[PDB]
Amino acid sequence: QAEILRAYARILEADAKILEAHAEILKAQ
Amino acid sequence: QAEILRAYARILEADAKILEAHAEILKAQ
Amino acid sequence: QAEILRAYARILEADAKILEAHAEILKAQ
Amino acid sequence: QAEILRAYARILEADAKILEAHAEILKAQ
Amino acid sequence: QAEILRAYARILEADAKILEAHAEILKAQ
Amino acid sequence: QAEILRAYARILEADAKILEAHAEILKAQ
Amino acid sequence: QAEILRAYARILEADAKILEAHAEILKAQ
Amino acid sequence: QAEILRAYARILEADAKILEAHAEILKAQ
Amino acid sequence: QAEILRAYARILEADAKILEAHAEILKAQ
Amino acid sequence: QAEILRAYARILEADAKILEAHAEILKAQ
Amino acid sequence: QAEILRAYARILEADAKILEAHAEILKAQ
Amino acid sequence: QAEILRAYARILEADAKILEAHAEILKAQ
Amino acid sequence: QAEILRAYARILEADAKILEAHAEILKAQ
Amino acid sequence: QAEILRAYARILEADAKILEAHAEILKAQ
Amino acid sequence: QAEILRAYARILEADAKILEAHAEILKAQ
Amino acid sequence: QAEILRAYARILEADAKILEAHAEILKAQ
Amino acid sequence: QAEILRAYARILEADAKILEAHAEILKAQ
Amino acid sequence: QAEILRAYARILEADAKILEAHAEILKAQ
Amino acid sequence: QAEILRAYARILEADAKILEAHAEILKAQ
Amino acid sequence: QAEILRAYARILEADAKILEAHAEILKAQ
Amino acid sequence: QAEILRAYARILEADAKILEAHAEILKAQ
Amino acid sequence: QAEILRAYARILEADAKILEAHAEILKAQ
Amino acid sequence: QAEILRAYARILEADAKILEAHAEILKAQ
Amino acid sequence: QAEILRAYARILEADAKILEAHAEILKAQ
Amino acid sequence: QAEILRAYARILEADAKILEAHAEILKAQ
Amino acid sequence: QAEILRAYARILEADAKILEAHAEILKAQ
Amino acid sequence: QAEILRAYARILEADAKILEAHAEILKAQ
Amino acid sequence: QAEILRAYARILEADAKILEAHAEILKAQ
Amino acid sequence: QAEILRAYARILEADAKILEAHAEILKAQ
Amino acid sequence: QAEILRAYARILEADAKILEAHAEILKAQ
Amino acid sequence: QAEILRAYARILEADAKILEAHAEILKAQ
Amino acid sequence: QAEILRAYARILEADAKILEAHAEILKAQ
Amino acid sequence: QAEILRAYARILEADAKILEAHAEILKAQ
Amino acid sequence: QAEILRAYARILEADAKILEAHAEILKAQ
Amino acid sequence: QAEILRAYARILEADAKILEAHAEILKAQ
Amino acid sequence: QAEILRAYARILEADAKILEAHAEILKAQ
Amino acid sequence: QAEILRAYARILEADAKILEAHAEILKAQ
Amino acid sequence: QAEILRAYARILEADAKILEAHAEILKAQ
Amino acid sequence: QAEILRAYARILEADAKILEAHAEILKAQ
Amino acid sequence: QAEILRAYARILEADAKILEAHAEILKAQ
């Protein structure tokens, strides 16, 4: 496992912080 | 499990946070 | 279970959050 | 149960939120 | 592993810290 | 490794400290 | 190595202290 | 080396102590 | 060297002691 | 050297004491 | 008489906050 | 008499908020 | 009688804070 | 009776802090 | 009776501090 | 009765300090 | 019973100091 | 019983001093 | 039993002084 | 068993003095 | 001329803020 | 002439804000 | 004349802050 | 003249902070 | 005159600090 | 005058420090 | 007068340090 | 009267040093 | 009276030195 | 009277040195 | 493309926001 | 490009923000 | 560029920030 | 540049910070 | 430069810092 | 300079530190 | 200078230190 | 100077030390 | 001086040492 | 001085030593 399926959320949460910052590099570009 | 089926929500919640950010890179593109 | 049958709502609530965002990527596409 | 019959409302409420967004993806199709 | 898949969360965490800083150089450039 | 894959985080953390300082030189330039 | 890849952090940490001081000379310049 | 690559940190640390002092001479100049 | 490359630190440490004292003659000047 | 480059540190070590005391005679001047 | 009957308004105001909260539990039940 | 009659209006104003909430609880009855 | 009946308002205010929190638990349940 | 019934408000205030914390655990569960 | 019932608030206050901390462990789990 | 039930708060306070530290060990894990 | 249950707090206080240090060793690992 | 359990705190206090020092060897490693 | 378990604290106190020095030998290494 | 274990502390106390002196001659090396 | 008549606007703007508040005191009176 | 006529508009706009509030005081008269 | 009549605006602004607060004391009275 | 009428603004601003706090003493009363 | 009326602004300033604290004693009473 | 009325400000500030501390004793009571 | 009323400030400041410490004894009690 | 009331400040200052230490004995008790 | 009440300060100062040291025997106990 | 109470200050001054050293023989025990 | 035809919709969407604002400036012409 | 034609949307979007601001100046003029 | 045409968006964005600020000055003028 | 045209954005950014500050002076004027 | 045009930003930044500070003096005036 | 124009920023920076301090002297005035 | 214009910054820096000290005397006055 | 203008900084530096100490005689007054 | 104007700094430095001690004589008074 | 003005510093230096000694005998008085 129940944590094993729960652990991918912490993986996939970090995939947002790539992308929501990836707009910011275009924002003041 | 009742948590095992509940834990997929925490998976699927962050799946949205990809996509709403995935528009934001195309927003100020 | 009464919660077991209730728990699928928290699944299915987030199931919309893909799709209402999955148009927003198509919105400013 | 009286809540067991009441619990399906929370299921079927979110069943709409799929579909009313599922036309919004066809809006900017 | 359960930590092995959990360890990449610490890997990808700082990958955002590159990019949000990598806009800040473009900010006052 | 589990530490070997963990060790690159300490590497990649310091890559940010270049860049967030690399804006500060351009900040009061 | 595991230390060999770990040792570059101590190298790269000091690369910040060049640069964050390299703004301070331009600060009261 | 493992010390050979480690020893440059002690070299590069003192390079900061030039520059953070190099602001101080310009500070009360 | 491993000492030969290490020995320049003892040179470069005292190079700071010129400069941090070089502000002090300008301090109470 | 190895002492030859090390001996210059002892030369430059005293060069601070020329200067760090040079302020002191300017201090109560 | 002025504030004494005024005080029951603050009493009766909180009675409204029970009942909608006593209804809000019935909504997502 | 000006405020004494006016104070009951603040009393009866809260009496509405009971009853509509008392019927709002019948909506999700 | 001024504060004595005013005191139950502070009592009854926190009674609402139970129930909406007693509702929020069933929301993400 | 002024403070005696006032004290239960401080008792009942923390009961709300249980339940939303008893809710927040089920959120990221 | 004044402090005797006041003390349970100090008991029950820290009981909230368990549960949000009992939630934060599941967040980065 | 006054201090005897007061002391458990000091016991239960440190019980929270376990768990957030038990949480922080998973963060950099 | 006053100090006897008080002393366990001093025991349990140090148990927090283990774990954050047992976490800090994971941070720069 | 009072000091006999008090002494384990002094035992466990020094156990924290190992681990942060066991982390400090990792930092400049 | 009092001093006998107290004596290990004086043992374990000196165990910290190894390791922080065992780090300090790595710092100027 | 009183000083028999305390004597090792006097042994291990000087063991730290070796290592910092093993560090100090590495400092001005 | 141009600003002098604009100055009375900033006067007369705040002249309403009495009156719209001067009903609010009569509102919950 | 262009702004001078427009300046009275900013006057006469705020002349309404007296009066529409000046009936609101008659609302709870 | 420009600032002299402008100063009454700063006077009359705070005249409102009496009255909107003067209702708030009557609000929870 | 100009500062003298501005001085009462600093006076009359403080008259608000009496009164807006004067409700707060009735708020948790 | 100008400071003499400004002096009461410092006087009445702390008069609020009585009352907002004089509610905080009533807050957790 | 101007200091004499300023003197009560230093008096009346300390009256607050009684009361805001006078709540803290009742806070963790 | 001017010091005589100033002297009670030094009196009344110390009345706080009784009370803010008087909570701290009840804090870890 | 100037020093005679000033002398109690030196009296009352040390009254705090009892109590802030009086917590410290109960702190590690 | 000036020294006679001042003498108790030298009494009461050392009254603290009992108690702050009285924790120290409980500290490393 | 003036010295007679100062004499007890010298008495109680040494009473700390009994106790503050009493921990020291317990410290390295 | 299908996006190439979709992209001009984002172009022409902004073309509306020019003109209504370009006529909004004619409202306060 | 497809982004090249998308880029002018970000150009033309800011053109709207001029004109309403070029109108908002005309409003309070 | 594609960034070159994107670069004027950052130029033209700040051009709007002039004008609304160039309007806000005329508001409180 | 592309940075040359980007550089004027940093120039024109601070021009907005003049004018609202050039407005805020007229607000409390 | 490109720095020459960047340098005026550092000039014009502090020009904003005058005016808001030139406003704050008029606030508490 | 390029430093010559940078030098006035250090001049104009301290000009702001006058005025807020020139403001703070009116606050407690 | 270039130092000549830099030297006035050291002059004008101390001018700020007068005025806040010229305020702190007015604070506890 | 260039030193002649630098010398007045050392003059004016000590002028600050009067005034903050001039406040300290008022604080414990 | 150039020393003549520098010499008054040594005069004015000791002027501060009067006053802070002239405060310290008030503290334990 | 040039010594004539410098000699008063040696006069005024010992003048501080009177006053702190005038304070120190007041401390243990």
Author numbering:
A (entry chain g), B (entry chain k), C (entry chain o), D (entry chain s), E (entry chain D), F (entry chain c), ...: 1 to 29
Sentences from the paper on this structure:
Therefore, the designed series of Form I-like peptides encompassed minimal peptide sequences in which the structurally determinative distance between the RxxxR motif and the C-terminus was systematically varied over the range from 2 to 5 heptad repeats. Three filaments, derived from peptides 15-10-3, 29-24-3, and 36-31-3, were selected for further analysis using cryo-EM imaging with direct electron detection. Five protofilaments interacted to form the 15-10-3 filament, four interacted in the 29-24-3 filament, and three interacted in the 36-31-3 filament. The Form I/29-17-3 structure fits the observed trend, in that the 17 amino acid length of the structurally determinative segment lay between the 10 amino acid and 24 amino acid segment length of 15-10-3 and 29-24-3, respectively. Similarly, the 4-start helices of 29-17-3 and 29-24-3 and the 3-start helices of 36-31-3, passing through every fourth subunit and every third subunit, respectively, were associated with the axial stacking direction of the protofilaments within the corresponding assemblies. For the 29-24-3 peptide, the interaction occurred between the C-terminus of peptide (ia) and the RxxxR motif of peptide (ib + 1), in contrast to the C5-symmetric structure of 15-10-3 that involved helices ia and ib. First, the tilt angle of the core peptide with respect to the plane normal to the filament axis became progressively more negative with increasing peptide length. Despite the differences in cross-sectional geometry for the respective filaments, the helix crossing angles were remarkably similar and lay within the range from 95° to 105°. The length and flexibility of the arginine side-chains enabled the conservation of the RxxxR lateral interaction between protofilaments despite differences in peptide length.
